[PDB]
Design a protein around this ligand. Sequence first.
Ligand SMILES: [Mg+2]
Ligand SMILES: [Mg+2]
Ligand SMILES: [Mg+2]
Ligand SMILES: [Mg+2]
Ligand SMILES: [Mg+2]
Ligand SMILES: [Mg+2]
Ligand SMILES: [Mg+2]
Ligand SMILES: [Mg+2]
Ligand SMILES: [Mg+2]
Ligand SMILES: [Mg+2]
Ligand SMILES: [Mg+2]
Ligand SMILES: [Mg+2]
Ligand SMILES: [Mg+2]
Ligand SMILES: [Mg+2]
Ligand SMILES: [Mg+2]
Ligand SMILES: [Mg+2]
Ligand SMILES: [Mg+2]
Ligand SMILES: [Mg+2]
Ligand SMILES: [Mg+2]
Ligand SMILES: [Mg+2]
Ligand SMILES: [Mg+2]
Ligand SMILES: [Mg+2]
Ligand SMILES: [Mg+2]
Ligand SMILES: [Mg+2]
Ligand SMILES: [Mg+2]
Ligand SMILES: [Mg+2]
Ligand SMILES: [Mg+2]
Ligand SMILES: [Mg+2]
Ligand SMILES: [Mg+2]
Ligand SMILES: [Mg+2]
Ligand SMILES: [Mg+2]
Ligand SMILES: [Mg+2]
Ligand SMILES: [Mg+2]
Ligand SMILES: [Mg+2]
Lengths: 123, 59, 72, 175
Amino acid sequence: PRYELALILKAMQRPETAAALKRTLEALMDRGAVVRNLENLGERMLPYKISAHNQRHSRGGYFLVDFYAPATTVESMMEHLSRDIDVIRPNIVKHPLTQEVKECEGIVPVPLEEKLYSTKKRK
Amino acid sequence: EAQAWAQLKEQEVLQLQEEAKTFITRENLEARVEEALDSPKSYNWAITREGLVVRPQQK
Amino acid sequence: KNILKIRRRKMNHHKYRKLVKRTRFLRRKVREGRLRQKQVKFERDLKRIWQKAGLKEAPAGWQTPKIYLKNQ
Amino acid sequence: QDDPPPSMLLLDYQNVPGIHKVDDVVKRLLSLEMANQKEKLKIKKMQLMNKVLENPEDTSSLEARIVALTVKIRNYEEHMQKHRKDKAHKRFLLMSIDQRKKMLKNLRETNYAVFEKICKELGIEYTFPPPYHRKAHRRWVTKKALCTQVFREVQKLKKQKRALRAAAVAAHKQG
RNA sequence: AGAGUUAAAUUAUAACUAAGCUGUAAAAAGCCCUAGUUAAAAUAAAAUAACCCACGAAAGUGACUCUAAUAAUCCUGACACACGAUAGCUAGGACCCAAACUGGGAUUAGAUACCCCACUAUGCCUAGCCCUAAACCCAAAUAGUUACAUAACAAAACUA
Ligand SMILES: [Mg+2]
Ligand SMILES: [Mg+2]
Ligand SMILES: [Mg+2]
Ligand SMILES: [Mg+2]
Ligand SMILES: [Mg+2]
Ligand SMILES: [Mg+2]
Ligand SMILES: [Mg+2]
Ligand SMILES: [Mg+2]
Ligand SMILES: [Mg+2]
Ligand SMILES: [Mg+2]
Ligand SMILES: [Mg+2]
Ligand SMILES: [Mg+2]
Ligand SMILES: [Mg+2]
Ligand SMILES: [Mg+2]
Ligand SMILES: [Mg+2]
Ligand SMILES: [Mg+2]
Ligand SMILES: [Mg+2]
Ligand SMILES: [Mg+2]
Ligand SMILES: [Mg+2]
Ligand SMILES: [Mg+2]
Ligand SMILES: [Mg+2]
Ligand SMILES: [Mg+2]
Ligand SMILES: [Mg+2]
Ligand SMILES: [Mg+2]
Ligand SMILES: [Mg+2]
Ligand SMILES: [Mg+2]
Ligand SMILES: [Mg+2]
Ligand SMILES: [Mg+2]
Ligand SMILES: [Mg+2]
Ligand SMILES: [Mg+2]
Ligand SMILES: [Mg+2]
Ligand SMILES: [Mg+2]
Ligand SMILES: [Mg+2]
Ligand SMILES: [Mg+2]
């Protein structure tokens, strides 16, 4: 997977939820994006109250959209989630599973350093 | 090393061939939307000092 | 220590700045007078070139620009 | 300006078997459509290093390095067209260019014909580093402008003085 | 270098409550269109992580996300070429906070200061300059070696 879309959406009922989800996904496919999977993390009380579009929201729906999109495109996508009155906050992050795990080998111990101060017979 | 690279790229291309069937398309919109609405997946994860993982408790 | 060399400089610099304020406008007069010699000696350097190269007048299309007196 | 097409099927995926029977979704993902800019640079690199060169296999060749450098250079040229305030990159570019000119010098010393080919293909025109790097300033460039004027006036008036005598001695010799 | 984003704080400005609030060794001045609590954008600045030691040629760089991206099959090299912290200049914006300056209050033989109160250029953004620092790690660059060896101190001594 290439890009990840963290969506926090206004807390709602079922219909308008499916509405926001689909229309957003269609914006994505519209910029040329290709969607791998769609993930709902539940609806929770947010870590803090966020102020979006003349509204300070307490609760919210949590969503994850993983997709492939071209470099040029990404900026545009953000604009489209930006003016959207129902999005409590957009973010697009380089997808976590692209990043490599190069093995933590362990702790290679750092011994005490020597030959800093010169040998002097002082006092 | 030409062998090695040929193999790797073959593995990859066939993997994306596999996941090509799993994608969300103009059709899958109504289906997948209402499917994910149904099924919350938890990413929540914890750790213990031994290195053992303990995921969220079974419900 | 070495400060005592440096301290000298400090005083010797400070005492300069003071001077440059009091003597300031006097210094402007002398300076602009000095550009007024500059541009002129430039001129003679060129006139000497016509009058060595034999032409009485300056070559066609020569206004002989003022560089030293340039401002703005 | 050249154009490594949207459908060009990323360089590391180009030579693997059974690609062209595959569905449009995966050909859309492995297209230069979804790629970083580094991949499109790998492509421009491939193409330039085939068209200009002889032995595309040699990296160590002075010539192939000249090419790759020209690629990075061109990349930085667009990048410096977009960002006009970015000094870091401007330095990258301005140095890169002189490394290229250093090694072009190195080739004009060793292999002539190949060097002439590289000049003809990539668009690089090798010019001599001049004698005496100096700072041309107002006064000097001015004095030189005048001097050139005085010169082109003196030889002109000389031509008038010699043609008056050519016309007079000719008109006396004829009748 | 762009483009977007904001966590804690602060403040406009409202609503309750209190008459005091701010400030020092100690006091005055100052504000009471003040303070506390409850609400809240804009600008600015980026706790902790860091007991880390990465990146950049140096200056520098440690809030968040993405795009662009780190010269050289790699010795040295100018007065040439491109950079360069703070402060400063020019024009257009910004202004919560800080603050040269100036004005009050004290301190004092005096106080053009140290201490307090305001408040400005000025720090901030865009374009263009100016090209200076104890720009210092006061240790030139690139190969090397730990053999000879202690002026003194400090970052032990040397070849090419
Ligand atoms: Mg010692
Ligand atoms: Mg003196
Ligand atoms: Mg003089
Ligand atoms: Mg040479
Ligand atoms: Mg002649
Ligand atoms: Mg900017
Ligand atoms: Mg307040
Ligand atoms: Mg106190
Ligand atoms: Mg009072
Ligand atoms: Mg710290
Ligand atoms: Mg550090
Ligand atoms: Mg790149
Ligand atoms: Mg490098
Ligand atoms: Mg080097
Ligand atoms: Mg060098
Ligand atoms: Mg500067
Ligand atoms: Mg400034
Ligand atoms: Mg201004
Ligand atoms: Mg101000
Ligand atoms: Mg304001
Ligand atoms: Mg203030
Ligand atoms: Mg006073
Ligand atoms: Mg006294
Ligand atoms: Mg004292
Ligand atoms: Mg103020
Ligand atoms: Mg600044
Ligand atoms: Mg420094
Ligand atoms: Mg120092
Ligand atoms: Mg330093
Ligand atoms: Mg020095
Ligand atoms: Mg010295
Ligand atoms: Mg050097
Ligand atoms: Mg040795
Ligand atoms: Mg001794």
